[PDB]
Write a protein that binds this ligand. Structure first.
Ligand SMILES: CCCCCCCCCCC[C@H](O)CC(=O)SCCNC(=O)CCNC(=O)[C@H](O)C(C)(C)COP(=O)(O)O
Ligand code: SF4
Ligand code: SF4
Ligand code: FES
Ligand SMILES: [Zn+2]
Lengths: 198, 83, 687, 114, 83, 77, 26, 118
């Protein structure tokens, strides 16, 4: 059993209401998980406003952006779930603000609020395809220069569609449709028996 | 013009085909008796209006729609097909 | 009314009277852990691994057994019902031999998982274990019964689903071993289901002994083509060869069970299989060659000949799509000489109304019948999962079964009216005694097997049965949607063929011999090359070289139902779709394309060029083909009778006899079956 | 329906942007074929830009078109600068790969699954 | 040749590989090695089979040497035990 | 248990390449202080959770106890 | 304690076996 | 202000899939059945859509299975039939949904089989 300190569960819950009251407009759900973490959920339009309040509020200073990520739930209408994890060196605490974005409904960029996001937002565009308005320079960071397709999308094949080899005839590296010599063995692992939720 | 096959595709329990099935219920036996070799196919489509498909010689198929047509019009159209 | 309100942890799931504790949990959404209880098998209570705790009650109750009462609260995840599982799992595991890396029900174990989820982290059985003695239950089921958790599912299935009543418990104490007292093999169809139903890996499949392990197996859901019940099945393929075929549940057709033939004849699918398109050499011996050359051998002969000169004799196991591609093709050469090997009487309305040739009483209608008149077929060996239907409805409900055939082992108590087709007329006269039984019945059903029709007086046998169905219907005054007359087939591509307007019987080819014949998977002896014209130019279109291959001027290899997205239809017209589990082998190709391609080389190109297009083609010739899983309700029995009355034929005194008299008859029938080493081992075991 | 806009309210405005990008590429093709010493013909290259531009000609969704040029513009930048070395550019021409026939008879003769 | 007798054949297009380089096959094939193993006689109806060495063996199983008709064979060692 | 040890974070001023360097040399120094303690105070005990549910069972146990094999098989597979 | 390169190969067998044409001419 | 589009979100142009695998790939939306081997039903809950199976030729050097189809091992899981159908439409893959078939209620009672009568 982990050493839960209820002292925290309460204080963070109380902040969660605080934020919910301070920004009734964009906060849709707020919950302090049993893992002692707060995850305010905001309408995509509240990206700029909710972050700024957390970066610059005396009772909630959340100066650094730990991470910007986008889970992809294909079932969910709004496919991506942009998640921003923020830290407060002052109150030694953290909060995650997560929004929802669909493939062709872009989110605002927070490079203004935190310049840390300049790179992570480019990372989210390259892997998932979400677009960030007002970004200084959005362009693929991790994928190859000519890569077609957004890789971390759940609908993208792991091996991908193109692989590279050197061809003598043309004396230059050349893409070809992927031909794998041992396909990824897709072990089915889920067990047909569940675990009675505690 | 020999037609090897005559096919009737009567959708079931739908207002439009009522007349089409009425034809079968009343005169199918008659037709078959008369043309005792020709294969008259009674088939049941769905969400489609009835069609009297006819296959003429050398793989040519022809279509006559039976949507909302009376029992004798269906009889007349069938009789027109095997001339 | 009749809605007991009980709380599953407070959910107040209102259930009908007689709902068992477990059933309520299912409805609310939970699933009480369980070893001895199978939905279609009687409750036994042997394991007691399902103990739950109804609220305010001293002891925990047996879920599968207690009928839930009013006001109860089935606390499932309580501190008690977990000590009632943490302590049972202690016992099942205590005498268990830990050879999980031998037990090929490794990931397919309902006892490790339940242990990993409802069991304890460690063992306290510091004492010694027990061992039983492996015996022989047959050539299909490997009983390493030291694994057995004495859950008595087998003894139930072997008595309740199948009527074998052989397997039984022997002895008491911790050496109760559930094996045949004397070593008599468990020989019956429906036999392999024991494997699937034993949650432990005590008895498992001997052919699929150690070829794989379940996490690896990629599972593609497809349709049974060995028999005409069209049982749903899942083909488990690893790295591209089929490793096992196990049932998948279809309430109406095969409800979790499949035949011994259609799960051990996946091995037959892998040998004697045609792959490259050979063509005859100068000396006559067949020689391999590229498609282009083999196809134009056929196309050139096709352009030269026409009309009667060209024919087809479609064999069994040929998909509907291929059928419509072969008819369109032979129709563009002015030939309607398209015939199936199984002769269905076609002198009155046949093939024209779609009820003359279809079980009008859906398989799930055998459950709501009252008297069944089996005439001239052995269901046990012609439709094993329909014999089961009449098995369940004779046990749980009260069907009065009557057979007019050979007195034959039917796994149930039937009434043998006699072995003479004439007796049909007798009942029609009403003179026969059973007339009263039929008269007493309110929802009766006649079933005329296709094999009775395959005799020479089959036209007369169908007409005689239709007369009796007519007055049975009149005397009973049975309601219109209840349908007394139905006929069951034993060839997968017979209802589809008759549907597309293929005319049954090779009688037409017999009267005028075709210069060219394109056998389409036909391994039957319906027409032989001596019978054919001098030219005898015939080209086999199929998957296994059996009877049609060595007498074939061209070999155009095709695929099998594990290897194509084709459609089939069982006996009450439910069209179903096989999915491609494995890509077809060698240069072998899908049946529909070979014929679309031959047509392009010939020049009378068929309209479709992709399979959705061929599905659209099937729609224009027939409805069932495109709508899947959908039985066609209305039929026109009354006009069928009128034409039957016009037809006059004599039923010869020769008794009508099913060809599959005993089970050795059953194991090898079609091509894949014949090519089965497992079926061959089974055949010699019987002999 | 009822969908928020990205950069163009209507296909009309969006098409304006496509025109600009076409021009951009058109003006750039020659330079690339020289700064990358590519062994292609400018006329050929511009044809490629046309082909690629046309390949997506069917779209009529304002939002989809806007992203398409955003992406297109990004490709230009890379190509404008030398971020995309020749291997990258020539890939557009699919020079090494063997073309596959689309004729049914052709496929039948070669692949199990067409 | 090998355990399951792998025999790239005189006509295979793969036997090309060994040209100028030998094949990997095994002497003292195991198939015959346990067959060469004496039958472990025992007194008790049932016997264990740690594989020899406990933790350094196989998961312990108890074999029923109850019928002289058959010498139990632990599914792991292939050791026959003679009642 | 970085809570039970005692170390000094090496904070820096006039942050620049040289200052941070000095910080990295100082954490090399402070880590030796933390390592010393860990050697001085490491407890007798087990090195993996006892929940066969999460941690794989010991090999002597999986080769003599059925619940341990089942837990070994399921955990690895 | 007081030419020989391992050539890799598949050790499984033929699996699918094709039907031998009858050598008897007809 | 929002703009109006009646065009079925098709984003086939942005997904980045090769043309061949968007026009020749049929995906089936189905709820997985249960390996008859086990009686647990926790794998028959969520709908899955799976792309059509393709070539798996043997590899000459080692005999390993080899596949040229990228979308083979991909099976996406969708909670409801409506959502899965949506994924096929906007991605442009053809779909053929199969209705969930759930076990019919079955009446059971230990007392019933004890009936000598029947
Ligand atoms: C040799 C040099 C290589 C350079 C190749 C280049 O970088 C790669 C490339 O061009 S990437 C092409 C993608 N370019 C688009 O996707 C624009 C789509 N534009 C529209 O769809 C319009 O909205 C409209 C509906 C009006 C089209 O209609 P229209 O028929 O063109 O008229
Ligand atoms: S049954 Fe086979 S797998 Fe399941 S536990 Fe017993 S041994 Fe291990
Ligand atoms: S064999 Fe399998 S099914 Fe028959 S009792 Fe033993 S465990 Fe239960
Ligand atoms: S399932 Fe409840 S007793 Fe076996
Ligand atoms: Zn051993």
């Amino acid at each position: 059993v982990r050493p839960r300190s209820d002292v925290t569960h309460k204080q963070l819950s109380a902040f969660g209401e605080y934020v919910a009251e301070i920004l009734p407009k964009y906060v849709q759900q707020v919950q302090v998980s049993c893992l002692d973490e707060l995850e305010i959920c905001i309408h995509p339009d509240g990206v700029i406003p909710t972050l700024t309040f957390l970066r610059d509020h005396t009772n909630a200073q959340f100066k650094s952006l730990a991470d910007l990520t986008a889970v992809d739930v294909p079932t969910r209408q709004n496919r991506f779930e942009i998640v921003y994890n923020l830290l407060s060196l002052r109150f030694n605490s953290r909060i995650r603000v997560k929004t929802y974005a669909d493939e062709l409904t872009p989110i605002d960029s927070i490079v203004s609020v935190h310049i840390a996001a300049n790179w992570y937002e480019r990372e989210v565009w390259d892997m998932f395809g979400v677009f960030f308005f007002n970004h200084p320079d959005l362009r693929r960071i991790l994928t190859d220069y000519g890569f077609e397709g957004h890789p971390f999308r759940k609908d993208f094949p792991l091996t991908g569609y193109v692989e590279l080899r050197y061809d003598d005839e043309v004396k230059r590296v050349v893409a070809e449709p992927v031909e794998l010599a041992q396909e990824f063995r897709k072990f089915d692992l889920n067990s047909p028996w569940e675990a009675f939720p505690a | 013009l020999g037609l090897r096959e005559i096919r009737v595709h009567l959708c079931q329990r739908s207002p439009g085909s009522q007349g089409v099935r009425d034809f079968i219920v009343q005169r199918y036996v008659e037709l078959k008796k008369a043309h005792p070799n020709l294969p008259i196919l009674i088939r049941e489509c769905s969400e489609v209006q009835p069609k009297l498909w006819a296959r003429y010689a050398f793989g040519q198929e022809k279509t006559v729609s039976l949507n909302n047509l009376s029992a004798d019009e269906v009889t007349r159209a069938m009789q027109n097909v095997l001339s | 009314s009749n809605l007991i309100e009980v709380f599953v942890d407070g959910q107040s799931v209102m259930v009908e009277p007689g709902t068992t504790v477990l059933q309520a949990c299912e409805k609310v959404g939970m699933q009480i852990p369980r070893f001895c209880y199978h939905e279609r098998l009687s409750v036994a209570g042997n394991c007691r691994m399902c103990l739950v705790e109804i609220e305010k009650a001293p002891k925990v109750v047996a879920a599968c057994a207690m009928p839930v009462m009013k006001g109860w609260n089935i606390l499932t995840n309580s501190e008690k019902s977990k000590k009632a599982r943490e302590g049972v799992m202690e016992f099942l595991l205590a005498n268990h031999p830990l050879d999980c890396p031998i037990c090929d029900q490794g990931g397919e174990c309902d006892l490790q998982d339940q242990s990993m989820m409802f069991g304890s982290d460690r063992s306290r059985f510091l004492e010694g274990k027990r061992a039983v003695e492996d015996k022989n239950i047959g050539p299909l089921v490997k009983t390493i019964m030291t694994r057995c958790i004495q859950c008595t599912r087998c003894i139930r299935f072997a008595s309740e689903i199948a009527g074998v009543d052989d397997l039984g418990t022997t002895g008491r104490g911790n050496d109760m071993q559930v094996g045949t007292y004397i070593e008599k093999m468990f020989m019956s169809e429906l036999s392999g289901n024991v494997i699937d139903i034993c949650p432990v890996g005590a008895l498992t499949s001997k052919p699929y002994a150690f070829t794989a392990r379940p996490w690896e197996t990629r599972k593609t859901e497809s349709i049974d083509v060995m028999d005409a019940v069209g049982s749903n099945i899942v083909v488990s393929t690893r790295t591209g060869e089929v490793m096992r075929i196990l049932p998948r549940m279809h309430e109406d057709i095969n409800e979790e069970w499949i035949s011994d033939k259609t799960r051990f004849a996946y091995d037959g699918l892998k040998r004697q299989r045609l792959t490259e398109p050979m063509v005859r050499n100068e000396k006559g011996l067949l020689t391999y060659t590229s498609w282009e050359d083999a196809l134009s051998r056929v196309a050139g002969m096709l352009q030269n000949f026409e009309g009667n000169a060209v024919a087809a004799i479609a064999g069994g196991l040929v998909d509907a799509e291929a059928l419509v591609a072969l008819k369109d093709l032979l129709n563009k050469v002015d030939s309607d000489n398209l015939c199936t090997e199984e002769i269905f009487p076609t002198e009155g309305a046949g093939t024209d109304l779609r009820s003359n040739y279809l079980l009008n009483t859906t398989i799930a209608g055998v459950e709501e019948a009252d008297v069944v008149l089996l005439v001239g077929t052995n269901p046990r060996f012609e439709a094993p999962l329909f014999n089961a239907r009449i098995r369940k409805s004779w046990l749980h409900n009260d069907l009065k079964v009557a057979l007019i055939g050979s007195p034959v082992d039917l796994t149930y108590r039937y009434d043998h009216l006699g072995d003479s087709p004439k007796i049909l007329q007798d009942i029609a006269s009403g003179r026969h005694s059973f007339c009263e039984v039929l008269k007493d019945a309110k929802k009766p059903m006649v079933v005329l097997g296709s094999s009775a029709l395959q005799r020479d007086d089959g036209a007369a046998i169908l007409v005689a049965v239709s007369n009796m169905v007519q007055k049975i219907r009149v005397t009973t005054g049975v309601a219109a949607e209840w349908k007394v007359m139905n006929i069951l087939h034993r060839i997968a591509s017979q209802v589809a063929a008759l549907d597309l307007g293929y005319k049954p019987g090779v009688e037409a080819i017999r009267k005028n011999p075709p210069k060219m014949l394109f056998l389409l998977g036909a391994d039957g002896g319906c027409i032989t090359r001596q019978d054919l014209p001098k030219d005898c130019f015939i080209v086999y279109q199929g998957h296994h070289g059996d009877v049609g291959a060595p007498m074939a001027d061209v070999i155009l290899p095709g695929a099998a139902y594990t290897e194509k997205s084709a459609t089939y239809v069982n006996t009450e017209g439910r069209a179903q779709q096989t999915k491609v589990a494995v890509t077809p082998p060698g240069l072998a190709r899908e049946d529909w394309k070979i014929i679309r391609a031959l047509s392009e080389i010939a020049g009378i190109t068929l309209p479709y060029d992709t399979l959705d297009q061929v599905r659209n083609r099937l729609e224009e010739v027939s409805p069932n083909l495109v709508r899947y899983d959908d039985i066609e309700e209305t039929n026109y029995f009354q006009q069928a009778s009128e034409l039957a009355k016009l037809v006059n034929q004599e039923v010869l005194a020769d008794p009508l006899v099913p060809p599959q008299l005993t089970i050795k008859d059953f194991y090898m029938t079609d091509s894949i079956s014949r090519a089965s080493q497992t079926m061959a081992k089974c055949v010699k075991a019987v002999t | 329906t009822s969908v928020k806009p990205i950069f163009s309210r209507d296909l009309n405005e969006a098409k304006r942007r496509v025109r600009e990008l076409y021009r951009a590429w058109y003006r750039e093709v020659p330079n690339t074929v020289h700064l990358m010493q590519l062994d292609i013909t400018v006329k050929q290259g511009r044809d490629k830009v046309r082909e690629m531009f046309m390949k997506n000609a069917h779209v009529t969704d304002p939002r989809v078109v806007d992203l398409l040029v955003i992406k297109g513009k990004m490709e230009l930048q890379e190509t404008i600068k030398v971020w995309k070395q020749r291997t990258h550019v020539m890939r557009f021409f699919h020079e090494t790969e063997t073309p596959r026939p689309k004729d049914f008879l052709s496929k039948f003769y070669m692949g199990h699954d067409p | 040749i090998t355990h399951t007798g792998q025999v790239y054949d005189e006509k295979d297009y793969r036997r090309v590989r060994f040209v100028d380089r030998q094949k990997e096959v095994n002497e003292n094939f195991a198939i015959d090695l346990i067959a060469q193993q004496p039958v472990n006689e025992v007194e008790h109806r049932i016997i264990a089979c740690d594989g020899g060495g406990g933790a350094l063996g196989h998961p312990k199983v108890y074999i029923n040497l109850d019928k002289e008709t058959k010498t139990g064979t632990c599914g792991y060692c292939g050791l026959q035990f003679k009642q | 248990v970085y809570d039970q040890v005692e170390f000094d974070v090496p904070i820096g001023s006039r942050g620049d390449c040289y200052d941070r360097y000095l910080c990295r040399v100082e954490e090399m120094r402070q880590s030796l202080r933390i390592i010393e303690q860990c050697l001085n105070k490491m407890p007798p005990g087990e090195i993996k959770v006892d929940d066969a549910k999460v941690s794989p069972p010991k090999r002597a146990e999986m080769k003599t106890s059925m619940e341990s094999l089942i837990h070994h098989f399921k955990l690895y597979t | 304690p007081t030419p020989e390169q391992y050539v890799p190969y598949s050790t499984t067998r033929k699996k699918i076996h094709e039907w031998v044409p009858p050598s008897t001419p007809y | 202000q929002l703009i109006t589009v009646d065009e079925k979100l098709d984003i086939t142009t942005l997904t980045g899939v090769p043309e061949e695998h968007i026009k020749t790939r049929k995906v089936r939306i189905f709820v997985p059945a249960r390996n008859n081997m086990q009686s647990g039903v926790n794998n028959t809950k969520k709908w899955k859509m799976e792309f059509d199976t393709r070539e798996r030729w043997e590899n000459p050097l080692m005999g390993w299975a080899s596949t040229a189809d990228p979308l083979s091992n991909m099976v996406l899981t969708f909670s409801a039939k409506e959502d899965a159908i949506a994924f096929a439409e906007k991605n442009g893959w053809s779909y053929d949904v199969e209705e969930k078939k759930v076990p019919k209620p079955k009446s059971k009672s230990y007392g019933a089989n004890f009936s000598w009568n029947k």
